[model samples]
Target: TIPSSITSGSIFDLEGDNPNPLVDDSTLVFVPLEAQHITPNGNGWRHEYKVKESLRVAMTQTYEVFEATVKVEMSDGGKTIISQHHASDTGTISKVYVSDTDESGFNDSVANNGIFDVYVRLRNTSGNEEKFALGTMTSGETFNLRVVNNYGDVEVTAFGNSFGIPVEDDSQSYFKFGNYLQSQDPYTLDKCGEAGNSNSFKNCFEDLGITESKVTMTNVSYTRETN
Candidate 1:
């Protein structure tokens, strides 16, 4: 039974094309772009972490922190994006460590209605030379959807009608973070990487073979426990 004061949002049918099933309904709440503890993606919000700009790690060898010498590369078609230290005042990142420990593995915990994407990087730095992954650990493995944090702790959650809900699934409950206050955009996948990045995006991207790049390894230690 849902609380009387709480107006449940719309819930998309499970079988429907709505990707975010848990997005809306009497079930999970739908978080908007802005709220008390919530932040809107398209609205006025301070983006602590911006895609491709903040948070970086090395791939040659798993280190704990980012060295000014770390070299990163973002390849789009024939173009390559080389990144150094992330430039921003809000983004939080942890030290670089090998994710050889797969506890629950990667799971899509997204409630159908939420809007966010995340990913894991195979090579933190374009260092490895053998596989063209020179200097860095090219053999690293990256996993997608592996919520990095202590279990039972959801950063964002839904409270109203979600994605597939009867309506627009517009509720006031904050998704994931039921206790702690959430910043603007936590668990941001937009800055994580583009489509074809096997470890990010929805399972559809992970399942397809076209332009697909799986997370060969992971090194997300910076700001692992931060919101």
Candidate 2:
């Protein structure tokens, strides 16, 4: 069973249960999604899916409230969604590669906690995981999906046309952040936290209490899912 985060909408399914998932390649299911590279307010998301597969999606996030998984595809098509995790869950979420999941929405106790990691990776296999397609996120804007990869390190790129957010070289040990509390960043614009480099600077800007968030400052605390 897929995690509730990935299944609550239209992404994956088996045996025709998910009538319309993101993408069904027979060999794989591409949860075609735009991701939010960072974490934000609350611990839940606010997006929709376009069930294109033959299976239906369900969420067990609040299992007590969401019992009895059904087999009906979503009809809203693809809509922008948002989710948040608790600040306390960061360490666990970050350290987690594919362990903590909400396939049945088991524990709402963690609900409202910051869930910064993305790629609700249900990748049980390798080649299949690599084959999973992802959309590109653009600059500064909040991406659609929040993805985590096989590697424990969490990173975010644009989710627009390129799915690439090339940042400045990992130069200068100086780290940067943006928008006091934004979830993602303008990675393609700046990978390095230096001038002209967006990297984490933009995120710093936002976190530093800078209203405009144009300044590249640091020392702001973040509620990353990994802690």
Candidate 3:
């Protein structure tokens, strides 16, 4: 469905079930979203999505949960900013590139305690795995995650009704302006559940007729801060 003006509230349902979903039937739905890019004092924005039953309960108990996925992507402008640089030494950094990703949904059982965790990753310039923890999120809970960078200082926060106490953030500044950099970046911001399930995980869950996401992104927004 095409929209004439952007307004809050429901837009249109592009996909739906008719008679009933068969055992082996699934559908692919794509929604194009318009994003906002603002820059002021610090860089980065907060993202919030709802945790559902499958993610909380099913994932924790079964091996398939190990494979269930949640992925986020960003447009060139909408991408997360870990660092910025100027073109010349006398001047400032000219361009920035995509540096981080919520690529893999599985963090593996933490400490082998069977306390499965889903981690969001921030791509490193030095080539390392820098991650932020989402912990064992409960079903029906909403999490508010934020990332902000001031000069070389970066902070991450994941808090909400679900988290009585704020989860620790990832502020490692591996990529700095003068030291290292990327000339360009990509555009678009996206998050998907079960986007790409591991072959083994898919091997188990696929035939089980597991379609649709365990968690839902009810609300999402981005703001460029100016300070």
Candidate 4:
């Protein structure tokens, strides 16, 4: 069942400089790739969900879990983030992405056909970063993602696989989900510009060949247990 707090719209904290998402009864449609609204942190556009101020949890006594079933639409561009764990004092601790290529530029050649590779980026207590491959999913194919945060240890389960990481224990954290477009770097701009004038960054949607980039999430729920 969807959490009462979520369905009641009482714990919604939206970040990103882009326009609001199109919210249906149980689905959310994000078009950050079209908007190209750069965030205040000088990053790519996003339309993600964060918890309200009251629900932020410190890594001490609370055992929190966030679950959702999500489907991604194929796009010309890749590197769309679907979920993340954000720390108040330390910034984003972990995030999951669906991209056509790996970090080293190895194209899977399947993203255009509606299949995408999944990757996870995790930040440890010492601020070091670690990345892992979480497998692949087809566009329009629904998959479940469960993020369980027991104190400072986080376990992210997706694509029938689970990966664990430890976060900073002193900071408060929250769960975020939805479409966070991550291909707004200079390289993408250059490639898209080769097809046309994409200097403004807003008119590159066509040149980028991205017809649509969105995620539909259902069965969204959040629970917290006090220890």
Candidate 5:
């Protein structure tokens, strides 16, 4: 049963195209964006690990999906998108390594292993990667990551302490993180990219090297929306 204190949300129905389903006596209930598609082409969220700039800390999230990544920056002349690709199918396990390290200084070698600085790749899906570590995990498990974004600097941690360590020279202007699978051309697909019976949005993912992955999100409060 839903907590009586909560209000304002959508109901979940297994069948699509049914925007309004009448509650049968007390057999049904409601929840947050549970049965909604955050995005059919691409889905994700932008998290503010900290409201301030020029600071550094570790932030992690555990969710379900096929693949994931950390968005360090987003803009022209600078874009650093670190992503990991896993299976979108069912019955496979995923794993990621964790370690103690931060921004511009990353390594995948076991040598980096030690107390607080230990290294041992261990590896992912919906909950969020790169040339970093990869492993197999059960659906019952969750993905864990520790992202350290210092001002314009960035790094990621997985497992309990394994980090893939990023290059010291590369960087971005912004620090926004989340799961993503966006269209390389959104404005085009809606018009020129589509037709009465043909939906060009179908191949948009392959054009951008995305496949088999889907995004699902819950418990989010948006600060912005286009429509």
Candidate 6:
């Protein structure tokens, strides 16, 4: 079972299209199906682990960290995949996510065939955003990701590389991790055209010859400190 400090969020669906949480002894598995229903936040398909409301902190006064060992299984379907994120702030900043870019379709300059180009999406107070490459990961590869907020400076460590950015002081922030698929491409949308039901979405997935994206997290940990 997932810890009380974290809660799960995803699309609202009783059908199998919705990604369900699976606990295999000590590991937690999340399966986010492509072309599924959109989230209540009007985003792509996702099954994310969100920090409990009571755990949210003001970045200027407290330090927070979330770390986990993650393994992803999915093909390069020519779209962006957000696997982790830090969200919520008092400023214009909404969220910053760890994105994986694929080659042959996303057209990202950093895209590489058979390897996911790991990047961090950063947004300024004005809401202008840009992505910087962090490192790379192959399919079915297990790696560690750590997101930390140390008195307004947020840092992320992934695949043995680390980066940091200064966040607005007094901003309320929290962490989320899972597979959030970016399925807004014309082809994907057209296949699920007006998908009013899960059956339609399932058919679309079959037509596209794509399987659901799976993410597994083990040894998840969280910590907070106040000074």
Positional deviation of 93 in candidate 2, in angstroms?
A: 3.3
Against the reference, the lDDT scores of all candidates come to: 0.19, 0.22, 0.24, 0.65, 0.25, 0.53
Clashing pairs in 4: none
- Pick by TM-score: which candidate is best? 4
lDDT of 2 by residue, 1-227 (tens): 33343344333122222223333221112121122122332121112222223221111111110111111111111111221111122211211111111222222112112222122212121212211123321112233323322122333222321122211111111111111122222222122234333334444434422232111111111211211
Regarding TM-score, does 2 or 6 come out ahead? 6
- Residue-level lDDT tens digits of model 4 in 76-120: 445677888777753787788887642353235343445577767
Q: Model 6 — which ten-residue stretch has the worst lDDT?
A: 7-16
lDDT string for model 5 (33-143, tens) is 122223232232111111122321222211112112211112111111122212232211122222222322234222212212212221222222333433222212334
Q: How far out, in Å, is residue 206 in model 5?
A: 9.8
Sorting all predicted structures by lDDT, with the top scorer first, yields: 4, 6, 5, 3, 2, 1
* Count of clashes in candidate 1: 66
After TM-score superposition, the amount by which residue 145's alpha carbon in candidate 4 deviates from its true location, in angstroms, is 1.0
TM-score per candidate, in order? 0.17, 0.18, 0.30, 0.78, 0.28, 0.69
lDDT, residue 129, candidate 1: 11
lDDT of 3 by residue, 1-63 (tens): 111110121321111122111112121111112111111322222111112212222111211
- In model 5, state the lDDT of residue 69: 26
Model 3 vs. true fold: TM: 0.30
**lDDT (tens digit, per residue) of candidate 6 on 1-227:** 44434433321112133435545545766665732544334334556655555656666666778777877776554333444335563232224333333322222434324466565654544455444556666678777877777776777777787777775444455555666554443232322423234454455445544464677888876666766
lDDT of 1 by residue, 25-135 (tens): 323221111111212221111111122212222211121121111111111110111111221232212112111111122232232212111212121222211101111
Best by lDDT: 4
The positional error of residue 113 in candidate 3, measured at the CA in angstroms, is 12
Q: What's the residue-level lDDT of 91 in candidate 5?
A: 17
TM-score-sorted candidate list, best first: 4, 6, 3, 5, 2, 1
